[PDB]
Design a protein around this ligand. Sequence first.
Ligand SMILES: [Zn+2]
Ligand SMILES: [Zn+2]
Ligand SMILES: [Zn+2]
Ligand SMILES: [Zn+2]
Lengths: 68, 68, 66, 66
Amino acid sequence: DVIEVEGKVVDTMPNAMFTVELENGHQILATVSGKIRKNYIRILAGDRVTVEMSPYDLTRGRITYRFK
Amino acid sequence: DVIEVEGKVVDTMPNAMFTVELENGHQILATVSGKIRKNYIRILAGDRVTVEMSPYDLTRGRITYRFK
Amino acid sequence: IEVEGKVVDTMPNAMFTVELENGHQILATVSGKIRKNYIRILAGDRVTVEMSPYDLTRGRITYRFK
Amino acid sequence: IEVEGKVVDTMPNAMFTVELENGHQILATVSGKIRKNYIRILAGDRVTVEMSPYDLTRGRITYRFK
Ligand SMILES: [Zn+2]
Ligand SMILES: [Zn+2]
Ligand SMILES: [Zn+2]
Ligand SMILES: [Zn+2]
């Protein structure tokens, strides 16, 4: 399954992967969901996002929502 | 591994298990860490807590810290 | 002031569990307009929700997409 | 105003990654007193940290428990 966490986009990295900083200061690696791209939603630094975490891999995640 | 989430204690349940409501409104079932008990820390309703989530089981967790 | 979400669960007394797009799970009532027009809401339905100013875990369904 | 935590990582230029008891991971410097007294801080060491008022992800180690 997946758990959802919210965080701030800190760093813009190679093939559209992002560094997201959670509330507790921990940082996770994130890709962007296809739903976000095809809806012309841009993911900038400083943006707040919702990230779906693969349970087996708490290092990586996937951005499923951008606030505002 | 485990991921850490913060939430509010909503319900006091049977053998010292608690209902914790996370920031996103999702609710998880939680026990209390032995460190908390043996340090004479009480877990009341309305308390904010840090919960360690077993990755394989995102329904259940373990309270590892109480704020204030 | 409205958020978009999918209906996860139906509870008794016209209550609904809604998974918002932002990841939030809320407990939602239905607006007066929704009831008067006999709009049937089932699990999986996409809805718009007006959040409660007093409770951030609750809101009311203002529209059901067909 | 102090929080308790365990040293996770040592970085160059007297920087430390600290896992606080509340679950927060912060990047910590060392207080002037700590440096002057040549206090050696290693991974696994328990420390007290004064949080930064301006950055909630940063702080400074004020004491190392032996
Ligand atoms: Zn926190
Ligand atoms: Zn949220
Ligand atoms: Zn959710
Ligand atoms: Zn942590």
